Enzyme design. Structure first.
Site, PDB file in Angstrom:
ATOM      1  N   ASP A 164      -9.285  -2.568   8.196  1.00  0.00           N
ATOM      2  CA  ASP A 164      -9.785  -1.730   9.269  1.00  0.00           C
ATOM      3  C   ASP A 164     -10.411  -2.592  10.344  1.00  0.00           C
ATOM      4  OD1 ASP A 164      -9.082   0.491   7.807  1.00  0.00           O
ATOM      5  OD2 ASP A 164     -11.178   0.945   7.176  1.00  0.00           O
TER       6      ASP A 164
ATOM      7  N   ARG B  25       0.832  -1.222   0.000  1.00  0.00           N
ATOM      8  CA  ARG B  25       0.000   0.000   0.000  1.00  0.00           C
ATOM      9  C   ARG B  25       0.862   1.267   0.000  1.00  0.00           C
ATOM     10  NH1 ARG B  25      -4.949   1.374   3.729  1.00  0.00           N
ATOM     11  NH2 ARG B  25      -4.987   3.636   3.536  1.00  0.00           N
TER      12      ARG B  25
ATOM     13  N   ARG C 233      -5.911   2.336  -3.224  1.00  0.00           N
ATOM     14  CA  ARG C 233      -5.071   1.548  -2.328  1.00  0.00           C
ATOM     15  C   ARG C 233      -5.204   0.077  -2.662  1.00  0.00           C
ATOM     16  NH1 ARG C 233      -8.210   3.676   1.891  1.00  0.00           N
ATOM     17  NH2 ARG C 233      -6.965   5.521   1.294  1.00  0.00           N
TER      18      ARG C 233
HETATM   19  N1  LIG Z   1     -10.494   0.952  13.699  1.00  0.00           N
HETATM   20  C1  LIG Z   1      -9.308   1.232  13.057  1.00  0.00           C
HETATM   21  N2  LIG Z   1      -8.808   0.330  12.179  1.00  0.00           N
HETATM   22  C2  LIG Z   1      -7.660   0.629  11.563  1.00  0.00           C
HETATM   23  N3  LIG Z   1      -6.857   1.721  11.674  1.00  0.00           N
HETATM   24  C3  LIG Z   1      -7.401   2.594  12.556  1.00  0.00           C
HETATM   25  C4  LIG Z   1      -8.573   2.422  13.253  1.00  0.00           C
HETATM   26  N4  LIG Z   1      -8.859   3.507  14.081  1.00  0.00           N
HETATM   27  C5  LIG Z   1      -7.838   4.366  13.860  1.00  0.00           C
HETATM   28  N5  LIG Z   1      -6.937   3.829  12.949  1.00  0.00           N
HETATM   29  C6  LIG Z   1      -5.679   4.491  12.501  1.00  0.00           C
HETATM   30  O1  LIG Z   1      -5.958   4.985  11.192  1.00  0.00           O
HETATM   31  C7  LIG Z   1      -4.661   5.184  10.696  1.00  0.00           C
HETATM   32  C8  LIG Z   1      -4.762   5.536   9.188  1.00  0.00           C
HETATM   33  O2  LIG Z   1      -5.234   4.434   8.453  1.00  0.00           O
HETATM   34  P1  LIG Z   1      -5.874   4.503   6.984  1.00  0.00           P
HETATM   35  O3  LIG Z   1      -6.071   3.077   6.631  1.00  0.00           O
HETATM   36  O4  LIG Z   1      -4.927   5.345   6.192  1.00  0.00           O
HETATM   37  C9  LIG Z   1      -7.490   5.293   7.216  1.00  0.00           C
HETATM   38  P2  LIG Z   1      -8.640   4.658   6.019  1.00  0.00           P
HETATM   39  O5  LIG Z   1      -8.979   3.241   6.391  1.00  0.00           O
HETATM   40  O6  LIG Z   1      -8.219   4.908   4.601  1.00  0.00           O
HETATM   41  O7  LIG Z   1      -9.967   5.510   6.295  1.00  0.00           O
HETATM   42  P3  LIG Z   1     -11.269   5.090   7.186  1.00  0.00           P
HETATM   43  O8  LIG Z   1     -10.783   5.042   8.602  1.00  0.00           O
HETATM   44  O9  LIG Z   1     -12.203   6.272   6.975  1.00  0.00           O
HETATM   45  O10 LIG Z   1     -11.824   3.778   6.608  1.00  0.00           O
HETATM   46  C10 LIG Z   1      -3.939   3.911  11.045  1.00  0.00           C
HETATM   47  O11 LIG Z   1      -2.546   4.083  11.031  1.00  0.00           O
HETATM   48  C11 LIG Z   1      -4.447   3.656  12.451  1.00  0.00           C
HETATM   49  O12 LIG Z   1      -3.544   4.133  13.505  1.00  0.00           O
HETATM   50  N1  LIG Z   2      -9.199   5.848  -4.018  1.00  0.00           N
HETATM   51  C1  LIG Z   2      -9.745   6.258  -3.087  1.00  0.00           C
HETATM   52  C2  LIG Z   2     -10.326   6.700  -1.895  1.00  0.00           C
HETATM   53  C3  LIG Z   2     -11.694   6.774  -1.817  1.00  0.00           C
HETATM   54  C4  LIG Z   2     -12.299   7.153  -0.637  1.00  0.00           C
HETATM   55  C5  LIG Z   2     -11.592   7.523   0.509  1.00  0.00           C
HETATM   56  C6  LIG Z   2     -12.240   7.794   1.899  1.00  0.00           C
HETATM   57  S1  LIG Z   2     -12.393   6.145   3.158  1.00  0.00           S
HETATM   58  C7  LIG Z   2     -13.113   4.829   2.225  1.00  0.00           C
HETATM   59  N2  LIG Z   2     -12.833   3.550   2.248  1.00  0.00           N
HETATM   60  C8  LIG Z   2     -13.732   2.983   1.366  1.00  0.00           C
HETATM   61  C9  LIG Z   2     -13.887   1.602   1.034  1.00  0.00           C
HETATM   62  O1  LIG Z   2     -13.210   0.611   1.432  1.00  0.00           O
HETATM   63  N3  LIG Z   2     -14.932   1.450   0.148  1.00  0.00           N
HETATM   64  C10 LIG Z   2     -15.730   2.510  -0.333  1.00  0.00           C
HETATM   65  N4  LIG Z   2     -16.693   2.061  -1.150  1.00  0.00           N
HETATM   66  N5  LIG Z   2     -15.555   3.754  -0.004  1.00  0.00           N
HETATM   67  C11 LIG Z   2     -14.569   3.948   0.868  1.00  0.00           C
HETATM   68  N6  LIG Z   2     -14.192   5.141   1.427  1.00  0.00           N
HETATM   69  C12 LIG Z   2     -10.224   7.484   0.328  1.00  0.00           C
HETATM   70  F1  LIG Z   2      -9.359   7.811   1.327  1.00  0.00           F
HETATM   71  C13 LIG Z   2      -9.576   7.063  -0.821  1.00  0.00           C
HETATM   72 MG   LIG Z   3      -7.606   1.796   7.068  1.00  0.00          MG
HETATM   73 MG   LIG Z   4     -10.767   2.321   5.648  1.00  0.00          MG
END
Ligand SMILES: Nc1ncnc2c1ncn2[C@@H]1O[C@H](COP(=O)(O)CP(=O)(O)OP(=O)(O)O)[C@@H](O)[C@H]1O
Ligand SMILES: N#Cc1ccc(CSc2nc3c(=O)[nH]c(N)nc3[nH]2)c(F)c1
Ligand SMILES: [Mg+2]
Ligand SMILES: [Mg+2]
Ligand code: NA
Ligand code: NA
Length: 157
Positions: free
Chosen positions: A97, A83, A92
């Site tokens: 998560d 990633r 990504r």
């Molecule tokens: N429930 C959770 N699961 C995973 N990472 C989490 C989390 N809560 C907070 N985080 C934190 O979120 C940080 C950034 O992770 P990213 O994967 O870049 C966010 P994302 O999943 O793209 O967005 P989202 O949280 O809106 O789905 C991680 O390094 C971690 O410390």
């Molecule tokens: N390229 C991209 C990109 C899109 C949305 C976000 C914001 S977070 C997010 N995660 C998910 C997921 O897994 N599925 C769906 N459908 N929407 C999501 N939105 C981002 F950061 C990056």
């Molecule tokens: Mg994440």
């Molecule tokens: Mg996410």
């Protein structure tokens, strides 16, 4: 042993292959056993600009790790799948998560569980309801089957 639920997503590369590899890697950590896997859904991106469609699923695990140990394994798996983390958000290879960790509520700078956005995300709740319909989301105190809503932007892949 704690029952936890992970949300997985991929929207670049060979999405299905990367999701399946991710699952395999997760299950290979000691302390994590994958016990159920939802169907895969193709989903429209939410929360951002126009972007490639995701493949999303949920995984049930039985784990003896602490929630921060578990987070470390989730982020290591993302690194295995190469990633990219640029200045701005974009597509990504893999996102792992933590959705639910037993009925615990954790609020730390690096970790929020239940995931702070899951209750309004069809790309989470639809596949989560496939494997966790009777599980209670502890902040709302609702079962997953009572949170889930119809959303046409989420389709069986
Ligand atoms: N429930 C959770 N699961 C995973 N990472 C989490 C989390 N809560 C907070 N985080 C934190 O979120 C940080 C950034 O992770 P990213 O994967 O870049 C966010 P994302 O999943 O793209 O967005 P989202 O949280 O809106 O789905 C991680 O390094 C971690 O410390
Ligand atoms: N390229 C991209 C990109 C899109 C949305 C976000 C914001 S977070 C997010 N995660 C998910 C997921 O897994 N599925 C769906 N459908 N929407 C999501 N939105 C981002 F950061 C990056
Ligand atoms: Mg994440
Ligand atoms: Mg996410
Ligand atoms: Na294991
Ligand atoms: Na916080």
């Amino acid at each position: 042993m704690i029952q936890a639920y992970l949300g997985l997503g991929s929207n670049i590369g060979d999405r299905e292959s990367q999701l399946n590899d991710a699952i395999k890697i997760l299950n290979e950590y000691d302390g994590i056993s994958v016990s159920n896997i939802s169907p895969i859904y193709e989903t429209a991106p939410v929360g951002y600009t126009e972007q490639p469609n995701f493949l999303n699923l949920c995984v049930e695990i039985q784990t003896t790790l602490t929630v921060l140990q578990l987070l470390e394994c989730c982020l290591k798996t993302e690194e295995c799948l190469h990633r990219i983390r640029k200045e701005r958000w974009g597509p990504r290879t893999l996102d792992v998560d933590i959705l639910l960790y037993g009925e615990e509520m954790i609020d730390l700078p690096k970790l929020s569980v239940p995931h702070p956005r899951m209750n309004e995300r069809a790309f989470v709740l639809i596949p989560l309801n496939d494997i966790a319909a009777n599980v209670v989301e502890p902040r709302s105190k609702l079962k997953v089957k009572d949170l889930v809503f119809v959303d046409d932007s989420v389709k069986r892949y």
